[PDB]
Design a protein around this ligand. Structure first.
Ligand code: MG
Ligand code: ZN
Ligand code: ZN
Ligand code: ZN
Lengths: 98, 549, 84, 93, 105, 174, 268, 171
RNA sequence: UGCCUGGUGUCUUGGGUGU
């Protein structure tokens, strides 16, 4: 798993709009199946069958989740888009021009 | 101290001796023989032994140890394997030299066409440099077009007429003037014939030709056994979460091995010469393009995607090649980059560093009895509070991360440990702007930690850097040792660079509005009242506390 | 054989800036590795400052070996090289 | 830390800083070389404390070096092309 | 050669110290003939193969060195840079020994 | 760990048969060749040591070190205990026990006379030092026995082997 | 091309092969940062001005040192040995003038970069020792002559007693010795600068120390410095000129764009 | 067989020992690290001659690590067995697979296949021995054996002896 | 007593920033 936090995800693996996010947080939760190992020996169903393929927020960016879009691609599979919003106030080093 | 202990003595390279690899040495240094073209055993992990991904060649997986040395991925250097060629092939990089050597010697008796009896030949042999010696010997013996079975007394020759050799791609044509005009025959000079001719060259003749008996023997220019590089040289890449991609070298080696298998199968079963020629020429092409894919005069080897194959030669040349892009200049750790800004209130040799950059970068300070108290305070403060620390390094080399330690207050520092403390004030750091046209483009400043996210410079140093504050960015490099810190503070420091050796004149002066204001302020009709004079005098750091009359 | 006798030493009798920088760095590193200090320390704590104080008093126990182009060398003590 | 920065560091005369930048702050690596053949073919097993060069059949005349990983890669790629760069820790004249 | 170089540099009023141009024109004419500052001039010296291959014609130089069994003495600065060693320059142009005589105090 | 004064020995192509260790063939390898070099690089001969000479040298060196460590103020057990290192102590104990239980000559003058006889002799001027050490060590009694034990002396028939053996037996303390 | 060139401990400038490029860096062994434009005073001016400035006559009263500047003006006139010393000094000055005017600088340019600024040293001495006031100096002429003569032999660029080493050492400081003798002449010291004794030894010691400090340091990578110093102006810049001409020069092109000759005709 | 050899050692010293007693400390460190060691190339180093007057020279400071490196040259007594050499021994153990003897610091194992057949191993004897009608070799018995093979280990040497030829066996 | 995770493609191309 990614070192970020998964606690902001909903039941369907998608974050909800209006939630403040920080760098490395997980905004899309996705897993890919993996052939199980011999852990079925004595593991009480607690054996790894899936591998994480989640999408984390960029490390240097943070903001508010603005709008989450869920639809189907041309192939009929699920397809999501997450838009993040933040405000940038001028500060020392910002470039201006006439 | 970052490497696990090894009892072998540690020394430094003093000489690099070049040469060719004999087939005996290739077989000796190898650890496995590569013969099966299939990369994967049954697509069920555990790559096939004897294949291109044999576990004995080395390990590139974290949980898999090398079966040859037993070391981990971080320590295994990779081990070579060898592939036996069914028929010898030319080395693509030595074909012109092979042609020259064929012109210099007789193709039957394997002896030089000229002897020391000729004064010019003896003069040429007298020279020392192997390349110039070979050039002179070739210039002389080129003219001699017939072997002499008798002295020009027997000189050891066979008396046969020497053919004229012409190059055509990877094939060499030898034309004999068989016996005014008659019918001459030009026949192909196969690599095997040239190889067995070269093996009969005497060591003295080999030395006369510029080759070295011990290190560069002429017949080693024909490839009879191929070394297979370890997977470290040709790592695989995971294109997506499921399918990984074989490297270009791996595919080329698979093609070469398939061609070798095809030649071996064809030879034992049935031998139409046309088919043999076609298949052996295919093998020669594959071996040649595996090492050089820019051979002028013939089409390049292409991938299934249509892109040309990245041969080994292409890996070493250009700006992005090995030498220019990874050895002469490489990406480095402990560095920062951000926009620069001006600060009139900074000394000449001071740079303003943001707090976040100061927290990210670090300097390993050895714990002694002069600073153990301060370093313990830094360790307590942790990696988020300035001044703080990021790691504690023990004598054995183990790193203690202070982010993930629940008992940071329960750490006692012993003498000789290192604390990777945060960047602090008056730390010398190297500061740089590209392009670095002259040596004043890299100078060492003293750190001053400041808020906001830009590097800050006294405006007098904007001239040597050729920098202004309209968006320029500059690079900062942190020394990581006492020796390096001393070198920076004693050699590259900004005050030492004021006068340049290019024109023996200063490179830094008063600039911009300070220059305008020192012209306006020093006019003859500028008078200043007492209350403003007091403020102006207090602003001078070096003022001695006496107001002038 | 390769060593040059003290009477026939012909190199400069001054500490060049490269030699000064290298000597200061090496001495600072050694002090940071708990080497004995040959001068009294008033209130100084920085290894580089202690090394500079040692150098000013000609107390650094190091020897410079200057390599001539032919391979011969001259051994100069840091206590007999003039420092500016 | 490109070539022009390397030239500036040469002009300053700071050899230690250049070595540290290109080794410690970058790809530093440790290899073992045979004292006879001069090749990086020593099969070193640090935990068992045994070193061995099969080609020369020796167990003693073996040294270790600290070289950039890119240099090791370059020498291995040269060996892949039948060129043998031999590293020796003593001069001969 | 010095006169021509100085004429080129000083046309726009710029000034470069004499010793630099003197060094350049002494390098260009040190072999008895004019040595152009190109691969055909620099790479035709007796310097180490590793130093020469770092400029231009890397692979061809490496093959020529291998076939001729060239020996590189690792005296240059490029050789020591690409091997991660202390170059024999600046602060690396000497050795520091330990003074067992002075430590007796 | 320790390195001999002989260095270089780089790669070549020829292989020789005089490389393998063999006492009978008197092939002792490069590091034990007949010609050696000292710290000054001058010519030096291989220095073999018989059990008498080895015992004399080890006893002298050990007692000198013991005297030095006590400020310059005989028992083999105490002498072994002088050295440092438990494994070193055991090794020197074993060597001392071997030398004592097989010492043919425990006197300095007897060993000196034996060495003079085995060196200054005209016949022995060609004898290899290893052969001399073996002769003084094994304490052979017969020409046939010595030849069987030392195959090298079989090819050297210009040696007064029997009378030299009798001289050694005489010098040997009964 | 120039990377592997470095000043060695014997003063020579060699590449990595050990081949000599120069027998002395910059032909004087100095560092590029430790030189300044100075005027050599023996070059310019007519013969009458040179004679008036430098000649001292102890027989003619009105052509001698002024009596108010020296305490010992009474027992100077009529001395013959001191006149011999002064004549030797003046002959040395005339030889320097001839050497500079006929060999080194034929066009008469006298403003050249030279080490240790003499004017700054002299005015520092004047400020330090309060050399104002009409007070008479106590500096005897033989002290001046011998002090300057000895100073011109302590400017060590090369150490050693070898004869060839001594010849190279003498060659390396010819121009600087000419400058020093031009400035520290007897008449100029006694009249123009009015130094006393203590100022004189201070000036001599300062000149020697500064010259020792202005030498080049073994271990300089002068090749890279030269390459950078030549390439830096090129980034900021009928015959061909500019970058194309520099490219023609460096490549040693056989057929340049505008070949030309400069034919000089005979005097008539 | 014992020999005199001129050996050299590389000694690295930590800066914390840079004191007036540096030379003597290097001497004892050399003695502790050389006396009694076993190198396959040379054999066994038993003693170092002139152990208190060994020249150490001038140590070189390792760039970047501060520690000084010393090159110490010394003369030492070395013992090394050779293939095909006959030497005296003392039996240390008796076992059905063969008997183990000691030649100084070296322990030599002789298998039954290299022992004359008449010397049948007697386990009933006290102590058990390989005995014949006129020969009886047990623990502590002097034996003359010929070394046939030597095995090289990390810091150990294993030799194999034989008594199957003439003038061998019990002495 | 229920007990805590560091591991990140490659190759092309295109548009830009500062000289
Ligand atoms: Mg700008
Ligand atoms: Zn491995
Ligand atoms: Zn012929
Ligand atoms: Zn080897």
């Amino acid at each position: 798993l990614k070192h970020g936090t998964y606690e902001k995800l909903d039941e369907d693996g998608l974050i909800a709009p209006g939630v403040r996010v920080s760098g490395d947080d997980i905004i899309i939760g996705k897993t890919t199946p993996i052939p199980p190992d011999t852990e079925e020996l004595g593991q009480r169903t607690k054996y790894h069958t899936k591998r994480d393929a989640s999408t984390p927020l960029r490390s240097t960016e943070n903001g508010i989740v603005d709008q989450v879009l869920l639809t189907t691609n041309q192939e009929g599979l699920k397809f999501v888009k997450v838009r993040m919003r933040t405000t940038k106030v001028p500060q020392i080093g910002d470039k201006f021009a006439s | 101290s970052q490497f696990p202990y090894s009892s072998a003595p540690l020394r430094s390279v003093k000489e690099v001796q070049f040469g060719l690899l004999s087939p005996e040495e290739i077989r000796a240094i190898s650890v496995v023989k590569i013969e099966y073209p299939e990369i994967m055993d049954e697509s069920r992990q555990r790559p096939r032994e004897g294949g291109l991904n044999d576990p004995k060649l080395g390990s590139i997986d974290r949980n898999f140890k090398c079966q040859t040395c037993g070391e981990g991925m971080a320590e295994c250097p990779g081990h070579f394997g060898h592939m036996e060629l069914a028929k010898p092939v030319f080395h693509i990089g030595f074909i012109p030299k092979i042609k020259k050597v064929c012109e210099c010697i007789c193709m039957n008796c394997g002896k030089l066409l000229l002897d020391e009896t000729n004064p010019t030949m003896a003069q040429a042999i007298r020279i020392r440099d192997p390349k110039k010696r070979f050039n002179a010997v070739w210039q002389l013996c080129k003219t001699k077009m017939v072997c002499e079975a008798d002295a020009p007394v027997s000189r050891g020759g066979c008396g046969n007429t020497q053919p004229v050799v012409r190059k055509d791609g990877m094939k060499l044509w030898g034309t004999w003037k068989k016996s005014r005009d008659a019918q001459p025959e030009r026949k192909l000079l196969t690599p095997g014939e040239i190889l067995n001719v070269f093996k009969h060259i005497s060591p003295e003749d080999c030395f006369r030709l510029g080759f070295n008996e011990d290190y560069a023997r002429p017949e080693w220019m024909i490839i009879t056994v191929l070394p297979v590089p370890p997977p470290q040289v040709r790592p695989s890449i995971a294109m997506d979460e499921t399918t990984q991609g074989q490297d270009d070298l791996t595919h080329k080696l698979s093609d070469i091995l398939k061609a070798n298998i095809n030649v071996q199968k064809l030879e034992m079963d049935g031998s139409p010469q046309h088919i043999i020629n076609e298949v052996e020429q295919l093998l020669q092409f594959h071996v040649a393009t595996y090492m050089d894919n820019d051979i002028a005069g013939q089409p390049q080897a292409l991938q299934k995607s249509g892109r040309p194959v990245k041969a080994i030669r292409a890996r070493l040349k250009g700006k992005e090649g090995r030498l220019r892009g990874n050895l002469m200049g490489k990406r480095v750790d402990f560095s920062a980059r951000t926009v620069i800004s001006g600060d009139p209130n900074l000394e000449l040799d001071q740079v303003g560093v943001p707090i976040s950059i100061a927290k990210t970068l670090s300097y390993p300070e050895t714990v002694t009895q002069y600073n153990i108290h301060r370093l313990t305070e830094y360790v307590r403060n942790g990696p988020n509070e300035h001044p703080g620390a990021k790691y504690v390094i023990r004598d054995n080399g183990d790193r203690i991360d202070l982010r993930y330690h629940k008992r940071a207050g329960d750490i006692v520092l012993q003498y000789g440990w290192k604390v990777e403390r945060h960047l602090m004030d008056d730390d010398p750091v190297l500061f740089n702007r590209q392009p670095s046209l002259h040596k004043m483009s890299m100078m060492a400043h003293r750190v001053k930690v400041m808020p906001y996210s830009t590097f800050r410079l006294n405006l007098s140093v904007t001239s040597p850097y050729n920098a202004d504050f309209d968006g320029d960015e500059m690079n900062l490099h942190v020394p990581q040792s006492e020796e390096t810190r001393a070198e920076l503070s004693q050699l590259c420091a900004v005050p030492l660079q004021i006068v340049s050796p290019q024109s023996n004149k200063p490179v830094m002066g008063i600039v911009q509005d300070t220059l305008c204001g020192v012209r306006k302020m020093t006019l003859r009709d500028t008078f200043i009242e007492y209350e403003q004079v007091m403020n102006m005098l207090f602003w001078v750091p070096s003022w001695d506390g006496v107001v002038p009359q | 054989e390769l060593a040059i006798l003290k009477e026939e030493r012909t190199t400069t009798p001054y500490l060049t800036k490269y030699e000064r920088a290298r000597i200061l760095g090496t001495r600072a590193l050694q002090i940071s590795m708990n080497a004995p200090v040959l001068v009294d320390i008033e209130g100084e704590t920085d290894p580089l400052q202690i090394a500079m104080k040692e150098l000013s008093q000609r107390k650094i126990p190091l020897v410079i070996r200057r390599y001539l182009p032919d391979g011969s060398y001259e051994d100069w003590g840091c206590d007999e090289l003039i420092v500016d | 830390f490109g070539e022009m920065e390397r030239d500036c560091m040469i002009a300053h005369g700071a050899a230690g800083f250049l070595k540290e930048r290109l080794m410690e702050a970058s790809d530093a690596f440790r290899v073992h070389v045979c004292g006879i053949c001069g090749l990086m073919s020593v099969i070193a097993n640090l935990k068992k404390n045994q070193f061995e060069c099969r080609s020369c059949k020796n167990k003693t005349n073996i040294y270790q070096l600290h070289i950039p990983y890119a240099a090791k890669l370059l020498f291995q790629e040269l060996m892949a092309m039948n060129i043998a760069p031999r590293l020796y820790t003593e001069r001969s004249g | 050669l010095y006169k021509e170089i100085l004429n080129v540099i000083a046309f726009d009023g710029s000034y470069v110290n004499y010793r630099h141009m003197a060094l350049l024109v002494d390098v260009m004419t040190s072999r008895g003939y004019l040595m152009a500052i190109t691969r055909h001039g620099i790479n035709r010296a007796d310097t180490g193969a590793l130093m020469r291959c770092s400029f231009e014609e890397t692979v061809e130089i490496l093959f020529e060195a291998g076939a001729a069994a060239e020996l590189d003495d690792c005296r240059g600065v490029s050789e020591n840079v690409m091997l991660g060693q202390l170059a024999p320059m600046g602060t690396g142009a000497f050795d520091v020994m330990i003074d067992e005589k002075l430590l007796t105090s | 760990v320790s390195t001999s004064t002989v260095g270089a020995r780089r790669r070549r192509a020829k292989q020789q048969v005089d490389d393998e260790e063999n006492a009978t063939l008197l092939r002792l390898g490069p590091e034990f060749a007949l010609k050696q070099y000292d710290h000054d690089g001058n010519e030096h001969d291989l220095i073999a040591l018989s059990l008498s000479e080895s015992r004399l040298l080890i006893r002298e060196a050990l007692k000198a070190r013991s005297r030095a460590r006590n400020g310059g103020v005989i028992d083999d057990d105490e002498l072994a205990k002088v050295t440092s290192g438990a494994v070193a102590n055991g090794v020197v104990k074993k060597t001392l026990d071997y030398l004592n239980t097989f010492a043919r000559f425990k006197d300095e003058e007897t060993c000196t006379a034996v060495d003079q006889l085995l060196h200054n002799s005209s016949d022995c001027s060609v004898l290899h030092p290893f052969e001399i050490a073996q002769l003084s060590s094994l304490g052979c009694e017969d020409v046939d026995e010595a030849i069987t034990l030392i195959p090298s002396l079989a090819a050297k028939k210009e040696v007064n082997l029997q009378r030299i053996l009798d001289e050694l037996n005489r010098l040997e303390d009964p | 091309a120039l990377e592997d060139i470095m000043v060695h401990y014997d003063g020579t400038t060699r590449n990595s092969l050990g081949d000599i490029i120069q027998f002395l860096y910059g032909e004087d062994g100095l560092d590029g940062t430790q030189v300044e434009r100075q005027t050599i005073d023996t070059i310019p001016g007519s013969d009458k001005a040179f004679h008036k400035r430098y000649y001292v006559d102890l027989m003619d009263e009105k052509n001698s040192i002024k009596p108010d500047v020296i305490e010992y003006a009474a027992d100077i006139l009529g001395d013959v040995e001191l006149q011999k010393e002064l004549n030797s000094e003046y002959e040395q000055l005339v030889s320097d003038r001839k050497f500079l005017r006929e060999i080194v600088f034929v066009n008469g340019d006298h403003n050249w970069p030279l080490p240790v600024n003499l004017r700054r040293i002299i005015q520092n001495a004047q400020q330090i020792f309060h050399l104002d006031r009409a007070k008479a100096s106590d500096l005897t002429i033989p002290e001046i002559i011998h002090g300057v003569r000895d100073l011109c032999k302590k400017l060590f660029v090369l150490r050693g007693e070898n004869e060839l080493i001594k010849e190279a050492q003498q060659n390396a400081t010819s121009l600087f010795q000419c400058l020093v003798r031009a400035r520290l002449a007897t008449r100029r010291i006694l009249e123009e600068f009015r130094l006393n004794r203590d100022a004189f030894e201070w000036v001599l010691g300062t000149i020697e120390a500064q010259f020792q400090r202005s030498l080049v340091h073994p271990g300089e990578m002068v090749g890279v410095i030269a390459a950078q110093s030549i390439g830096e102006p090129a980034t900021q810049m009928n015959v061909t000129l500019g970058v194309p001409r520099l490219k023609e020069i460096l490549n040693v092109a056989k057929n340049i764009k505008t070949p030309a000759l400069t034919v000089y005709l005979d005097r008539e | 067989m014992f020999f005199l050899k001129d050996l050299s050692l590389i000694l690295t010293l930590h800066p914390s020992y840079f004191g007036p007693q540096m030379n003597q400390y290097l001497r004892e460190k050399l003695l502790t690290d050389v006396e009694g060691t076993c190198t396959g190339q040379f054999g066994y180093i038993v003693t170092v001659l002139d152990g208190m007057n060994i020249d150490v020279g001038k140590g070189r400071i390792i760039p970047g690590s501060g520690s000084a490196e010393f090159e110490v040259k010394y003369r030492a007594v070395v013992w090394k067995p050779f293939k095909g050499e006959v030497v005296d021994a003392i039996v240390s153990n008796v076992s059905p697979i063969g008997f183990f003897a000691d030649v100084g610091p070296l322990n030599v194992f002789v298998s039954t296949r290299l022992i004359p057949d008449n010397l049948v191993y007697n386990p009933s004897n006290s102590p058990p021995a390989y005995m014949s009608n006129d020969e009886l070799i047990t623990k502590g018995s002097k034996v003359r054996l010929k070394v046939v093979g030597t095995r090289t280990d990390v810091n150990e040497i294993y030799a194999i002896g034989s008594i199957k030829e003439d003038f061998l066996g019990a002495i």
